[PDB]
């Protein structure tokens, strides 16, 4: 199977697989069962922003999620990503719906990684920022139901013409270029990611959520990963 | 054939195909016969830096090349790149040797492109910076004789164990991710590139040069483009 | 008097001092009488974005102004800023009202300057980005009627409690740190600025406009520069 | 007295004030007696690089110092800087000599701070990068013996014509613009700093070291802070 590190914005409490009984943000290291969670006061139909940060010195993966005019939610987990992920990875966004549904609309997404070596000319860096997604967005690998270019957004899961989110949908978008997250002369490696999302559901119980993830470069949507598994994991182990 | 836009650092005067009778920097639009050139006081064995800039408002492709402690050389050409290149491109470095030879060593390479739309959330951007190249540099597509990881550099053309550059060599490196250089809601599109290079030759007459180029995404080394054609063009038309 | 280089968003046609008979964007070099203008379809009450770009190789000051969903306006003028401005400058935003009035609200402002030398460690850079202005914004020098922190914006000219713009108002905001726009070993110097603004007026004839400007470091609002002179110039010469 | 947060590169072991018995890197929170240190294999006459990182989510101030071809040294300390520093600060470099001496030469210095709010237009940022310092470097406040423009470097402490470092010297350089390190709607605040330095001494026992620091905006060199106090503190409490 793939190797996954993810920050999940989990809109549906599956308490049977260890979610808390509320929408939450979580850090997922090789399992959908988050290593750490925090309560998230998800706002149906509002545009939210998630920020994810990490560096190889502190070895702490942290995320903050917020909406305008509201208090944020934050979660952190100590993990050495060099011990979890391969040296080259892809980074992406995933979302899913199941029997419950919601739009999983991404309005912007940015990412920066930096590897600073001990050579005085120190830095290798990659940065991208999408504030509009085009119908044929060649620097993204879209998987599953993900589409780009509808109102200039990235729709990770299926939405009908009329704006209605569909159930049992899964979709991901990965940045085209592999990302180097370790180098042998690196003295500091860091990354940050930000994305803005609009999750709306005609229903009181939206599902299932959106994740920012980092994976093996050849990562693909696991069989049966609609719903609670967020398009990230083959099972709930 | 491919579509090429390039800034050439041409170390060998091929006066039969319109080079001036000295090493020069040139702007090449769909032809090796530069649309504009400037004299370049190339310094054998010294590390030089080239800077290339362009934006869609001014529609002027400009480059400056310099060495420490020396006056720079600059060349500019008015060209609307949106009328030359496709909407998606790859960007890269190329170099070649022929019967005359030189190392075509790249010590660093950075690139930024920005498309700013009329939406208040305006910007799509891509930036990369390499200050060290690793043996398996997965975010570069190496073509021809190009190799990475020898002393942490990108050697565009063949060099033997002993540091000796080889003749009749051609090599390119393209960044892995396609680059979007036009979008329909863009009000300004710009790019800049910088690279540092070390061209050294045991010979009085080094050849052939290094170019930064932008091409169709599927660009490949043209048959017979060693030597004066810089790994960019199939012929000298 | 001060030395001013500015891009003006001129909302009021003063045809007696050479404005065209419509709202326009202009490049002003040491005079309010723009060296170059373009028609601007200013939208009362809508948030617009202005982008300004320049580099020392091309020596062309260009600006683009746009609103969402609308075609942009652009203006360019060939000028060597090193021959106009001192080596150190401040950069800022200015606006004014006169007998006609409008809000001159700045919602965001960013600026980047870069000087790249011929030393392989090439770059001196300054960048700032404001997306919210705080009541006591210590890295801005506010002049005249400019205030910060009202709804997190920079109000360049006086607005009453009720949101009503006041006539005969002038205000500027300059970034606190001087900016180096030339250095003796520089081979390329460039800058870009972006700001977002909301100009609204209860009146059919708003006035007078907003400018991004660059000036001597000690620049101050000229006596009698309310109205058509945009807080930039002492007279209309 | 001022409020100081600093990362020290302490070249001289003053074991009487709690330094370890070797050159070390340290995190100093309101005291010269570092809260955390790590051994540093300082290399006399070689150019080293220090990197400092912090964010308000993790509340961990970390630094890494390295030389080319050598293993790095790193130190971290959990501290909420919002509880130590005022909301606006200046950032700078300090160094000193005492009865023992060394050059305290800064060859480059860069700094980025970011405050990201919960408003979807999230970011306030400041970034500067110096790779050459000019004789009259108007965006730096030089204090004590600090000078700029000698070989394009920042010499924090006194050096004679002949390159000889002088004893009993203290000097600092602060960036001109205040820096906002907290805002009330901020959900993440972060900073990073990097500088490159050349510490050389004709003596076996160089002293005293270089620090990157953050202080009240009006920070000044404390009386009697030559030597072990690094130009940062009035005493060794
Ligand atoms: Ca769930
Ligand atoms: Ca040639
Ligand atoms: Ca006017
Ligand atoms: Ca000490
Ligand atoms: Mn969960
Ligand atoms: Mn040529
Ligand atoms: Mn005008
Ligand atoms: Mn110490
Ligand atoms: Xe992640
Ligand atoms: Xe974060
Ligand atoms: Xe990572
Ligand atoms: Xe990453
Ligand atoms: Xe990383
Ligand atoms: Xe190019
Ligand atoms: Xe350039
Ligand atoms: Xe381009
Ligand atoms: Xe490009
Ligand atoms: Xe471009
Ligand atoms: Xe300007
Ligand atoms: Xe522009
Ligand atoms: Xe400028
Ligand atoms: Xe400028
Ligand atoms: Xe500039
Ligand atoms: Xe610090
Ligand atoms: Xe660090
Ligand atoms: Xe800080
Ligand atoms: Xe800071
Ligand atoms: Xe900070």
Curated annotation (Swiss-Prot), chains A, B, C, D:
Alphabetized Pfam families for the sequence: Lectin_legB
Binding site for a carbohydrate: 14, 98-100, 208, 228
PROSITE patterns, sorted: LECTIN_LEGUME_ALPHA, LECTIN_LEGUME_BETA
Alphabetized SUPFAM superfamilies for the sequence: Concanavalin A-like lectins/glucanases
Reported modifications of this chain: Concanavalin A-like lectins of the Diocleinae subtribe undergo proteolytic processing referred to as circular permutation. The propeptide is split into an N-terminal and a C-terminal part, the gamma and beta chain, respectively. These are then religated in beta-gamma order to form the mature alpha chain. The beta and gamma chains can often be detected in cell extracts. Residues 1-118 of the mature chain, as displayed here, probably constitute the beta chain in the propeptide, residues 119-237 the gamma chain.
Binding site for Mn(2+): 8, 10, 19, 24
Signal peptide: none
Key words, A-Z: Calcium, Lectin, Manganese, Mannose-binding, Metal-binding
GO molecular function per UniProt: D-mannose binding; metal ion binding
Residues that, per the record, bind Ca(2+): 10, 12, 14, 19
Subunit structure: Homotetramer.
Additional record remark: Binds one manganese (or another transition metal) ion and one calcium ion. The metal ions are essential for the saccharide-binding and cell-agglutinating activities.
Protein family according to the UniProt entry: Belongs to the leguminous lectin family.
Role according to the record: Glucose/D-mannose specific lectin.
Protein name per UniProt: Concanavalin-A
Source organism of the structure: Canavalia cathartica
Lineage, highest ranks first: Eukaryota, Viridiplantae, Streptophyta, Embryophyta, Tracheophyta
